[PDB]
Amino acid sequence: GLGGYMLGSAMSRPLIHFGSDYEDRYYRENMHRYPNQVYYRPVDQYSNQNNFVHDCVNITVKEHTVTTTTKGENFTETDIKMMERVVEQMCITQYQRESQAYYQ
Numbered sequence: 001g002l003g004g005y006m007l008g009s010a011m012s013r014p015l016i017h018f019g020s021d022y023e024d025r026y027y028r029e030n031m032h033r034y035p036n037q038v039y040y041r042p043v044d045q046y047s048n049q050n051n052f053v054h055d056c057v058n059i060t061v062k063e064h065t066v067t068t069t070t071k072g073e074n075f076t077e078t079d080i081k082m083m084e085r086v087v088e089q090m091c092i093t094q095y096q097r098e099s100q101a102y103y104q
Contacts, residue, residue, distance in 0.1 A: 002039070005059065010036045011090040018082070027082060033073060034083055035064050038091040043098045056091035057084055 013031050018024070027034075038060040046052040061083060065075065075083070 005039050006042055007039050008037055008094045011038070011093065013086060014089050016082070016085050016089060023078070023082065026078075033068070034079075034086060035060055035090075038087055038094065039063060040091055040094060043095055043102065049092070049095065052095060053088050053091050057087045060087050060091070 013034070013036055015024070015027065038056050040046075040052065040056040040059075043052075046055060061080075064083075069075075
């Protein structure tokens with residue numbers, strides 16, 4: 001039943017900066033192997049910003065690792081650090097979209 005979560009529609013993957021020009025293509029040339037949809041709750045439930053984001057990160061990162069590892073892909077430790085910020089950024093965006101229309 002995937003607990004009882006909400007998964008969003010496909011997201012714009014932000015070009016988050018790092019520093020090494022390597023990582024900028026290690027991102028771009030590789031976008032498709034990192035997520036574009038994160039797994040969360042409506043702003044109703046886990047009614048925080050970053051404390052919802054950490055669960056969204058944890059669930060998405062963990063669902064995606066297992067699945068993609070079970071398809072014969074490996075992740076480097078910087079792939080973890082570059083996935084986490086991308087996942088947090090996109091998930092933050094998906095909450096903020098809702099709360100900004102809740103309020104308006």
